[PDB]
Design a protein around this nucleic acid. Structure first.
Lengths: 133, 225, 136, 52, 100, 145, 116, 131, 96
RNA sequence: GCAGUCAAGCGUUCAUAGCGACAUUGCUUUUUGAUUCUUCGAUGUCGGCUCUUCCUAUCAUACCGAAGCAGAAUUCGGUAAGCGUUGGAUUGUUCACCCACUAAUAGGGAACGUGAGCUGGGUUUAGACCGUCGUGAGACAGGUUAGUUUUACCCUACUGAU
């Protein structure tokens, strides 16, 4: 029956970690007039075990309980929303909205033959259209 | 120590993950398995119904400790957003891409020390050290390759699988700084990582774990005051 | 389901009928298997009993260590290569057929399993998920 | 397994008809019949437009 | 739902379409449709086939390097769901789509 | 000899008749059928633009696919979505009876919530949902400018 | 390494499992296995004449060895036999129920054409 | 489909592919692995004479001399020069993970590139003096 | 002679005779009975079947193994314009 | 072949919970005989494949009663044919025999179901070899090889259509 040891390797060591809320927690008692209910007792009080529905929501922390049950979009025309959301979107989008304003004035968006005028630059294309037919 | 069986399977570490600050359980069917963790933990630490890649086997797919939780590539964005909501801000969560999906068989760890599979890539090997805040050592238990199912750790002590040579125990315990005992769980099953779950103050094993093996488990992890 | 398989198995396309040699994935010492029957199967005139991703089959060994050769033993399929349906909308298939061998309870004989294991088999058999290096 | 026409299930099913599943049907046929009297209202308002 | 692009087509693969393929290296190959799939079994080259998007970003067609395209990467750090973040990103996606 | 797509033995010397149940050849299809317990998902309106828009998608699109249905025009009316497969084919007339009894199973009581409706082209392998998508993905063309 | 359900330390190596006598009970090793002639039948074609050493071997072929004393009049044959990592010898019983079917050789006397 | 594409390109008869082969050429350890493989009964050259580019076993050492002077092998050398086309290129063309893409192209151009082209210059020199 | 290998019948004898129906509108043979405590509720309706499409749905089915998971399935789309009443018919119960 | 009745020995005690020897009375034609009735100006004379229906003497499923029935697992019996009854190695084989699944791998009939539905492996002409017998032609239902499978458009029956 061999047992092993830490064997004095390095100076860095942990003490084992127990949260204080478990030491503050009362010990659970099975036959008990006053007690916390259970996940069982909420399950069997309305329908049986397999047929009762448990909300996975209303069990998680947020800023407001008003949006604890809201629904994410998850898909738009733009590909999928879980890829687009971020920290500082609008801070990064104003770096994009500034990329319009330097291009608008410089003529990046903007709407003729030498020696040949409107009746002559048209008619060469008009005479060539007859030759191809 | 507490004997608990998922629906009729004595394998618990397959189906559930247990850290110091949180605990994860599958969603299969009825809330008999979830309530047994309420009896020991209560509203102290969060206990979460979750799925990983649309499966029930969440204990062998994830691998983490009291700081971080790592999830594999096939985890959907709905499953990932669900874990972040149910766990508070003290816990870090990061989705990891790898050649190998099952992280629980590949990472065994306590709060500061982790062992890994040898073939794991070093782009994850830095990521384990950053998220979990732990050290990483590339090691094989007894010439067996999966470090998660054939070993189990806590900050208290450690338990390994019974093919481990005694020469291998004293070397491997020097890496983990904890005591090690070769033992069995669930009546002679070699797989000691998947049978039981353990943190510093609680250990849940199957209904087929014998009373002499409860004497082994409760002593090596020192559950008594 | 049957012995040891927890829960119910959802329907997937039948990839391996009787007489199909499939590769042996674990490190037990065999190289291939040979399906001779499928447990939990039906009974209809002239049907060959067909397996799928994650059913327990009776299988023999054609190539490998002589101790595991010439005796029938149960085996569990982990890779299919006949494309099935996940209930989220994508059909998928693996490279090649594969199976690991097991006792009738559902416990492994080897310790390691190479290659990816099918997700539908990893839910149903807990011990295969324990030795799974790669899932899906 | 019992047949579909067995007496032990049909005595078990008919209790579920008395309880949960009739009242959701009674909740259904009320909400349908609310829209049916509203169909008489919107189509007589268009008749009130043609009288103008 | 994760409208991932074709491995060969670079076109969106809605849920309920195409085939997936899994190699022994255990990466996934999610295919747009059967044309792309049967062209993968034959071992072809999307740098050579003119009709795919991997060709058009290569040979000097449609713009590849642009700051509008860096916003939609991937996230493994989940942002804990404020509403007013989600309301911005629904306006953000329709804005980038106009600039793109 | 003389065929292989048939039934070999058809009777016996007694009774000296072909029985009424021996699977002969004849008419197939165009029979009247009734299939029960089909579950209604979506009831939408014709004036209600964005019928295909769920609570997730939020893209203003109607359930009419790109270029309409195949051998059938546009849905610009009220519609019913029901799961499975109604007996009959396209542009045929169905009658929609209601359930004949109080249904007992848990499946026939649940509240559905559609997460996404496909509106891609059914005349071919559809990859785009709306022509606003295809024009976004293809980019500009020669025929535009 | 505590043997399961004993409490006794065993070797940490590849050995058997569980105490060799905590395993000796728990494993099971067997787990599987003419009215006018009085001539017992060999299943292909033969009808060997006949409770002990000679016929005791032929009943083992279809099923030490010993035959218990059950009853002459009723149609039972019961036999005890021992089966002989772990080597182990365990015995068990098999009831072979006797049925009677007519000897075609000794059916011929009833059809008057005996000689041939 | 037809007669020909079914015969050679099922899933029973698949080669390895251009993805996994490029990892084998990128470093010196894996090159020195695959030349010195342990001999097996089932491998065709008894577990020797393995071409890394065309992942193909040869029977004899003469059968490597005729393979390298061939337009089947000279296809595959011209195949594996540039960026090896993972899944990341197909998403980068859509406007998805460019910084994932533009950093790997930065890696293969400067770092892995002249290392990969050094392993090929040694293999053509190491398979020359042995033949 | 006893068939040597029992097998189930091919095809159903309930749906005989297999023949072309009298119309492209199948008539309804039976109705839900009469519940005389309810509002006046029209029973059946008539519309035109028009193609199919695919639907993903978050399966909220307690007890299933796809509980809280996504499930794709196919639906039908039937064009259903409004319908206008033109007649009333009464039926006397007879002993025929 | 199956079922009654008498009950010898047994089931440590005690005939009748359960087994069962032989006396004695029967039924069945899925047995071999007995007859040679109808067919010798051909009723195409083995098995398998395909396919429908019927019988109950019930292997499984439903509901019950009994015990030498704690539970679990079985054993015996009653009403019961609504619904099931397989995939394979060897043989031309029914028959037999083992391997494996399964709830279970029950027993029979309909011209020994079914050849203008098949198949031709077997049997059963002409060719040929061997063994025994015969002086000889030849014999052997002993062994072994090679050996043509014909028509429906007619009336009825049936599945559909006017």
């Amino acid at each position: 029956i061999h047992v092993a040891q830490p064997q004095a390797r390095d100076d860095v060591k942990r003490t084992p970690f127990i949260p204080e809320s478990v030491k503050n927690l009362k010990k659970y008692d099975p036959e008990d007039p006053n007690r916390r209910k259970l996940a069982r007792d909420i399950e069997a009080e309305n329908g049986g075990a397999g047929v009762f529905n448990v909300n996975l929501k209303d069990k998680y922390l947020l800023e407001d309980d008003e949006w604890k049950n809201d629904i994410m979009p998850e898909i738009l025309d733009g590909k999928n929303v879980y890829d687009f959301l971020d920290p500082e979107i609008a801070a990064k989008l104003q770096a994009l909205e500034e990329e319009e304003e330097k291009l608008e004035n410089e003529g990046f968006y903007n709407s003729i033959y030498d020696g040949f005028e409107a009746s002559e630059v048209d008619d060469i294309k008009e005479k060539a259209a007859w030759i191809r037919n | 120590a507490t004997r608990t069986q998922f629906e009729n399977s004595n394998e618990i570490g397959v189906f559930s993950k247990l850290t110091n600050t949180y605990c994860l359980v599958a969603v299969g069917g009825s809330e008999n398995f979830y309530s047994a963790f309420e009896a020991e933990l209560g509203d102290a630490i969060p206990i979460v119904h979750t799925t990983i890649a649309g499966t029930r086997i969440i204990g062998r797919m994830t691998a983490g400790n009291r700081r971080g939780l790592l999830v594999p590539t096939q985890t959907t964005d709905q499953e990932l957003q669900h874990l972040r909501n149910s766990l508070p801000d003290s816990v870090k969560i990061q989705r990891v891409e790898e050649r190998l999906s099952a992280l629980g068989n590949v990472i065994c760890c306590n709060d500061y020390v982790a062992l890994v599979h040898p073939d794991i890539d070093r782009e994850t090997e830095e990521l384990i050290s950053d998220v979990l805040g732990v050290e990483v050592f590339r090691q094989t238990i007894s010439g067996n390759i999966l470090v998660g199912s054939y070993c189990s750790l806590s900050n208290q002590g450690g338990l390994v699988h019974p093919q481990t040579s005694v020469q291998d125990q004293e070397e491997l315990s020097s890496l983990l700084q904890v005591p090690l005992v070769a033992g069995t769980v669930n009546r002679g099953s070699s797989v000691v990582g998947a049978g039981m779950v353990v943190n510093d103050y609680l250990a849940v094993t199957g209904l087929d774990t014998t009373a002499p093996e409860l004497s082994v488990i409760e002593s090596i992890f020192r559950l008594q005051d | 389901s049957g012995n040891g398989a927890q829960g119910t198995k959802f329907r997937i396309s039948l990839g391996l009928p009787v007489g199909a040699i499939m590769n042996c994935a674990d490190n037990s010492g065999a190289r291939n298997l040979y399906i001779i029957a499928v447990k939990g199967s039906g009974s209809r005139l002239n049907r060959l009993p067909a397996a799928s991703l994650g059913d327990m089959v009776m299988a023999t060994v054609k190539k490998g260590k002589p101790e595991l050769r010439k005796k029938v033993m149960p085996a569990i399929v982990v890779r299919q290569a006949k494309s099935w349906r996940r209930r989220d909308g994508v059909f998928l298939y693996f490279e090649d057929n594969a199976g690991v061998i097991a006792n009738p309870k559902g416990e492994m004989k080897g310790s390691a399993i190479t290659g990816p294991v099918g997700k539908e088999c990893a839910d149903l058999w807990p011990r295969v998920a324990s030795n799974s290096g790669v899932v899906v | 397994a019992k047949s579909l026409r067995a007496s032990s299930h049909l005595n078990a099913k008919s209790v579920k008809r008395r309880g949960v599943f009739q009242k959701a049907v009674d909740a259904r046929e009320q909400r349908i019949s609310d829209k049916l009297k509203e169909d008489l209202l919107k189509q007589k308002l268009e008749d009130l437009k043609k009288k103008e | 739902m994760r409208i991932y692009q074709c491995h060969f087509c670079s076109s969106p693969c809605y849920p309920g379409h195409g085939i997936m393929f899994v190699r022994n290296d255990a990466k996934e190959f999610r295919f747009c449709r059967s044309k792309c799939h049967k062209a993968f079994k034959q071992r072809r080259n999307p740098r050579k086939l003119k009709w795919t998007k991997a060709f058009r970003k290569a040979a000097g067609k449609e713009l590849a390097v642009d700051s509008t395209l860096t916003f939609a990467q991937r996230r493994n750090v989940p942002v804990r769901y404020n509403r007013e973040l989600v309301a911005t990103t629904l306006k953000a996606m329709a804005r980038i789509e106009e600039i793109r | 000899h003389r065929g292989l797509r048939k039934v070999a033995c058809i009777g016996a010397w007694h009774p000296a008749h072909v029985m009424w149940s021996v699977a002969r050849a004849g008419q197939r299809g165009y029979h009247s059928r009734t299939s029960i317990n089909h579950k209604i998902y979506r009831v939408g309106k014709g004036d209600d633009e964005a019928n295909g828009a769920t609570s997730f998608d939020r893209t203003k699109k109607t359930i009419t696919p790109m270029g309409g249905f195949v051998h059938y025009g546009e849905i610009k009316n009220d519609f019913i979505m029901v799961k499975g497969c109604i007996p009959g084919n396209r542009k045929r007339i169905v009658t929609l009876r209601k359930s004949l009894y109080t249904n007992t199973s848990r499946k026939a009581l649940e509240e559905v919530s559609l997460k996404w409706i496909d509106t891609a082209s059914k005349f071919g392998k559809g990859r785009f949902q709306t022509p606003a998508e295809k024009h976004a993905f293809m980019g500009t063309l020669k025929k535009d400018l | 390494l505590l043997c399961c359900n004993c409490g006794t330390p065993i070797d940490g190596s590849t050995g058997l499992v569980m105490c060799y006598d905590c395993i000796k009970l728990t494993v099971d090793i067997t787990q599987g296995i003419c009215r006018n002639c009085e001539r017992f039948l060999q299943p292909p074609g033969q009808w060997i004449r006949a409770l002990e050493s000679r016929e005791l071997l032929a009943i083992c072929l279809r099923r030490d060895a010993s035959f218990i004393w059950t009853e002459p009049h009723s149609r039972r044959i019961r036999i005890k036999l021992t089966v002989q990592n772990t080597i182990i010898q365990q015995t068990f019983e098999v009831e072979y129920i006797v049925i009677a079917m007519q000897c075609p050789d000794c059916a011929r006397s009833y059809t008057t054409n005996t000689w041939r | 489909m037809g007669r020909y594409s079914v015969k050679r390109y099922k899933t029973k008869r698949r080669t390895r592919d251009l993805d996994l082969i490029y990892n084998d050429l990128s470093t010196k350890e894996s090159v020195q692995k695959l030349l010195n493989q342990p001999l097996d009964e089932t491998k065709p050259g008894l577990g020797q004479h393995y071409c890394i580019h065309c992942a193909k076993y040869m029977e004899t050492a003469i059968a490597l001399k005729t393979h390298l002077k061939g337009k089947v092998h000279k296809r595959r050398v011209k195949e594996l020069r540039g960026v090896p086309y993972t899944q990341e290129v197909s998403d980068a063309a859509a406007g998805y993970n460019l910084n994932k893409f533009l950093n790997r192209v930065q890696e293969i151009t400067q770092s892995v590139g002249p290392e990969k082209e050094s392993n090929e210059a040694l293999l053509k020199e190491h398979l020359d003096s042995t033949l | 002679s006893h068939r040597k290998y029992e097998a189930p019948r091919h095809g159903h004898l309930g749906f005989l005779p297999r023949k072309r129906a009298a119309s492209i509108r199948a008539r309804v043979k039976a109705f839900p009975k009469d519940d005389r405590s309810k509002p006046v509720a029209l029973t059946s309706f008539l519309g035109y079947k028009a193609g199919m499409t695919t639907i993903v749905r978050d399966l909220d089915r307690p007890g299933s193994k796809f509980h809280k998971r996504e499930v794709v399935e196919a639906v039908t789309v039937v064009d259903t314009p409004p319908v206008v009443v033109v007649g009333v018919v009464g039926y006397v119960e007879t002993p025929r």
